[PDB]
Curated annotation (Swiss-Prot), chain C:
The modification N6-propionyllysine is found at K7, K20, K53, K55, K67. The modification Phosphothreonine is found at T56. This is Histone H4. The modification Phosphoserine is found at S23. Coiled coil: none annotated. The gene is H4C1. GO terms for cellular component: CENP-A containing nucleosome; chromosome, telomeric region; extracellular exosome; extracellular region; membrane; nucleoplasm; nucleosome; nucleus. The modification N6-lactoyllysine is found at K7, K53, K67. The keyword Nucleus applies. The chain holds residues 26 to 103 of 103 of the full protein. Signal peptide: none annotated. Changing R16C: In TEBIVANED2 and TEBIVANED3; uncertain significance; does not affect early development when expressed in zebrafish embryos. It comes from Homo sapiens.
Swiss-Prot record, chain D:
Changing R97H: In BRYLIB1; uncertain significance; decreased protein abundance; increased interaction with DAXX; not changed subcellular location. Acetylation is generally linked to gene activation. Acetylation at Lys-91 (H3K122ac) by EP300/p300 plays a central role in chromatin structure: localizes at the surface of the histone octamer and stimulates transcription, possibly by promoting nucleosome instability. H3R2me2a is present at the 3' of genes regardless of their transcription state and is enriched on inactive promoters, while it is absent on active promoters. This is Histone H3.3. It comes from Homo sapiens (Human). The modification N6-lactoyllysine is found at K25, K48. Changing R9C: In BRYLIB1; uncertain significance; increased protein abundance. Changing G3R: In GLM; glioblastoma multiforme samples; somatic mutation; also found in osteosarcoma samples; results in global decrease of H3K36me2 and H3K36me3 levels; has no effect on H3K27me3 levels. The chain holds residues 33 to 136 of 136 of the full protein. It is found in: Nucleus; Chromosome.
UniProtKB/Swiss-Prot annotation, chain E:
It is found in: Nucleus; Chromosome. The gene is H2AC4. This is Histone H2A type 1-B/E. The chain holds residues 65 to 119 of 130 of the full protein. The modification N5-methylglutamine is found at Q41. It comes from the Eukaryota. It is involved in the initiation of both imprinted and random X inactivation. Ubiquitinated H2A is enriched in inactive X chromosome chromatin. Ubiquitination of H2A functions downstream of methylation of 'Lys-27' of histone H3 (H3K27me). H2AK119Ub by RNF2/RING2 can also be induced by ultraviolet and may be involved in DNA repair. Glutamine methylation at Gln-41 (H2AQ104me) by FBL is specifically dedicated to polymerase I. It is present at 35S ribosomal DNA locus and impairs binding of the FACT complex.
Length: 52, 430, 78, 104, 55, 91
């Protein structure tokens, strides 16, 4: 999930909204240890949401 | 006791050698004929006075003797009549039969026998498994109260009931002075009986049976040995299997070895440990248990299960102490996912709201359980909301308001927890 | 398929050398040294074959490479 | 009372010394043919593919590898005996290779 | 010659690589000359250490 | 123990020969005498023999030190000498 490639690069979402999409994905999975500034946890959450 | 040698001999057909149901059974290497038979490199040592070939003796370096294989004449460099032809030459030790108090006939040494010396070759009919089953059923129908079967190898047994030798009269001893061994003679397999120690004249010759009952009922052992297990059976044990349930025992860091050690140290030294039952907790075992930090999430799940199951004060004390030793953040996050706070609420309530103990000891417990609550990583009151343990903390600081260190620690704890939030968290449909 | 050199096989190989007891950690070490030796001999045989303008490695290349490493083999047409 | 007395087990080393004599008397290959062939093909794949390997080349490679491993285990057994042990350890393997010159 | 003799102690009329390996390794000077050669299907001479044996 | 490390440090940095020249010369002549008599020797041949024998002995002592280290000892023994020679292949 922390790799060079990105899940959202295969979607129509603009790169300026990648953190918005990862916050949506993290909040949808009922995670509570998540902080907005932690990009790594956001990427892990969206990876487990799209590719469980 | 009076000799019963001839009387014992008349009870069965005496054999000088093992008889075979067929030529295929009992063959060495599962019948694979090793044409390159194992020839010892010993040089023949003929004593010119007695004309005896002393090669392959006890203190000689015969490889075949060490490997429990007998030299065969005409194949080995040791020559004929070497000192490793004990089975073939039938040079049995001198023995007598005497009537025992409870075991019937038994074998005694007519002379003093050296260590590792060959006593006697166990004789019988070599039979297959089906023949063994048929004979076993027939003898059980006959009501015979004596074992007469030995396992030559897998699927191949030796029967000593109707035909055999004096070795069938040897009685079981739980601390035996002799032992049975398996040897290779030519392309065949033999079962001999050898002296485990120095045995004096008149002493009974006994070996460990190591009985495979094949579902038969236990038979009580009357050997008289102090280390007797009391029954004939290839296995035996004490309460050294479980003292506490497996998830609860592994929650405390205890395993099969630690559950063995406590019972071995006390029960075998005249101190009482009850029969296996987890309804009553033995506090002394839990206090004496060793504690190591947790670094595995399955062990954390077992700890959570133990918290949800065990009601004992002392087990919970030692689990909380183990958690105090534990400092791995991932295990603590797993406990949070398992809602450890929910279990800790009940653990508190049972001890400091219900009062089955003393106020000083409960105070020590409370000081020993507030520390890891203060220490664990926390990022959101959603964690606590799954337990509402703060309410329990308020109730216990209100009850033990006289003990001001507990009150001040709970003040610090609620102050720390109240700073938490969840920034912005998207509401979900309901 | 380095795990194809199974534990009983390497136990047998040690047993031919007269070894009575075997440590539990030795098997990875034997697999490594066998891999190193095979790597060297296979490399030399492959470049011998590539010089010979062939596409199939014959036994002569193997025996040549081994003899050039001071490990002369008798019985394969040397 | 139809039970069977068990022959118990051998001491550690007795069956070891037996199988020592048996394997030192016989001469067959001790490594299975097909896994060794696959391993040789895997090593050869790294340089240039489409390389056919005659059965005689694989057999010669197997014989050389077995001879090398047997010699290494003899030297490592001498090393273990020298250190008053009967169990060989990887440190004896490394030392044997060091003194042999194979490892720099 | 040495290989035929070694076969003769084995009561065989067939010379095999085993007998050749026995003939080479049991003679000191022949072992010195053919030190660095491996005989295919020759095996190893039976040699068990003295302190390797049990007591 | 201190001067042992001092001797190691001094001799591992130096390059001159440590075997005395005249006894080694007499040793070479004594060994060569029993193969053929009235043998002459170039000085450079004696120097080459001295250098080669010193290099060989240094290598043997290094391998022997490894063997001694293996047996949890610090003192080298003759059994280390024949162990190193046996493994190295000399007879
Ligand atoms: N120590 C012991 N106490 C009571 N019975 C024993 C015993 N050791 C052996 N036995 C009995 O002896 C049987 C073995 S056959 C031994 C000889 C036979 N009991 C006789 O006197 O003629 C076993 O099946 C067992 O039932
Ligand atoms: Zn012998
Ligand atoms: Zn003999
Ligand atoms: Zn008993």
């Amino acid at each position: 999930p922390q790799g060079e490639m990105d899940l959202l690069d295969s979607t129509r979402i603009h790169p300026e909204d990648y953190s918005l999409a990862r916050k949506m994905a993290a909040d949808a999975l009922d995670i509570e240890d998540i902080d907005d500034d932690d990009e790594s946890a956001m990427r892990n959450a969206i990876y487990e949401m799209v590719f469980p | 006791p009076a000799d019963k040698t001839e009387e014992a001999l008349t009870t069965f057909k005496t054999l000088s050698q093992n008889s075979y149901q067929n030529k295929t059974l009992g063959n060495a290497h599962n019948g694979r004929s090793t044409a390159d038979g194992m020839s010892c490199d010993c040089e023949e040592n003929w004593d010119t006075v007695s004309g005896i070939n002393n090669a392959c003796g006890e203190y000689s370096e015969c490889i075949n003797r060490l490997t429990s294989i007998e030299c065969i004449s005409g194949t080995c460099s040791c020559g004929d009549d070497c000192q490793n032809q004990r089975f073939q030459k039938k040079q049995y030790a001198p023995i007598a039969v005497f009537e025992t108090e409870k075991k019937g006939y038994g074998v005694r040494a007519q002379a003093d026998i050296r260590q590792d010396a060959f006593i006697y070759e166990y004789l019988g009919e070599v039979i297959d498994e089906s023949t063994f089953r048929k004979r076993k059923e027939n003898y059980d129908n006959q009501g015979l109260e004596h074992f007469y079967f030995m396992m030559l190898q897998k699927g191949e047994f030796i029967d000593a009931t109707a035909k055999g030798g004096l070795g069938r009269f040897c009685n079981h001893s739980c601390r035996p002075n002799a032992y049975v061994d398996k040897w290779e003679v030519g392309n065949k397999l033999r079962m001999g009986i050898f002296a485990k120690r120095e045995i004096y004249k008149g002493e009974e010759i006994c070996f460990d049976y190591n009985v495979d009952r094949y579902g038969a009922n236990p038979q009580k052992c009357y050997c008289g040995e102090d280390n007797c297990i009391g029954f004939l059976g290839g296995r035996t044990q004490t309460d050294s299997a479980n003292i506490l349930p497996v998830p609860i025992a592994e929650a405390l860091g205890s395993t099969n070895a630690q559950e063995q050690r406590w019972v071995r140290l006390m029960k075998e030294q005249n101190k009482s440990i009850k029969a296996s039952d987890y309804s009553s907790i033995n506090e002394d075992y839990v206090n004496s248990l060793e504690m190591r930090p947790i670094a595995d999430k399955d062990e954390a799940s077992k700890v959570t299960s133990a918290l949800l199951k065990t009601q004992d004060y002392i087990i919970l004390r030692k689990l909380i102490e183990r958690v105090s030793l534990t400092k791995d953040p991932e295990v603590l996050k797993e406990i949070v996912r398992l809602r450890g706070y929910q279990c800790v609420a009940n653990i508190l309530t049972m001890i400091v709201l219900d009062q089955e103990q003393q106020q000083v000891d409960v105070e020590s417990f409370t000081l020993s359980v507030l520390d890891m609550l203060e220490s664990w990583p926390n990022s959101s009151r959603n964690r606590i909301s799954s337990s509402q343990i703060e309410s329990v903390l308020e109730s216990v600081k209100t009850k033990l308001k006289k003990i001001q260190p507990i009150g001040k620690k709970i003040n610090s704890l609620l102050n720390s927890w109240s700073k938490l939030e969840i920034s912005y968290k998207i509401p979900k449909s309901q | 398929n380095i795990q194809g050199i199974t534990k009983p096989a390497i136990r047998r190989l040690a047993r031919r050398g007269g070894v009575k007891r075997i440590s539990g950690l030795i098997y990875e070490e034997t697999r490594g040294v066998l891999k190193v030796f095979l790597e060297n001999v296979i490399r030399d045989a492959v470049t011998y074959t590539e010089h010979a303008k062939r596409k199939t490695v014959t036994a002569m290349d193997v025996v040549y490479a081994l003899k050039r490493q001071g490990r002369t083999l008798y019985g394969f047409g040397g | 009372t139809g039970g069977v007395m068990k022959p118990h087990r051998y001491r550690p080393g007795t069956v070891a010394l037996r199988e020592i004599r048996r394997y030192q008397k016989s001469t067959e290959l001790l490594i299975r043919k097909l896994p060794f062939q696959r391993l040789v093909r895997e090593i050869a794949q790294d340089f240039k593919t489409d390389l056919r390997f005659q059965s005689a080349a694989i057999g010669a490679l197997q014989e050389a590898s077995e001879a090398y491993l047997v010699g290494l285990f003899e030297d490592t057994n001498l090393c273990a005996i020298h250190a008053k042990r009967v169990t060989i350890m990887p440190k004896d393997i490394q030392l044997a290779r060091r003194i042999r010159g194979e490892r720099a | 010659e040495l290989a035929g003799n070694a076969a003769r102690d084995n009561k065989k009329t067939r010379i095999i690589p085993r007998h050749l390996q026995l003939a080479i390794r049991n003679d000191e000077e022949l072992n010195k000359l053919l030190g660095r050669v491996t005989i295919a299907q020759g095996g190893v001479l039976p040699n068990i250490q003295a302190v390797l044996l049990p007591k």
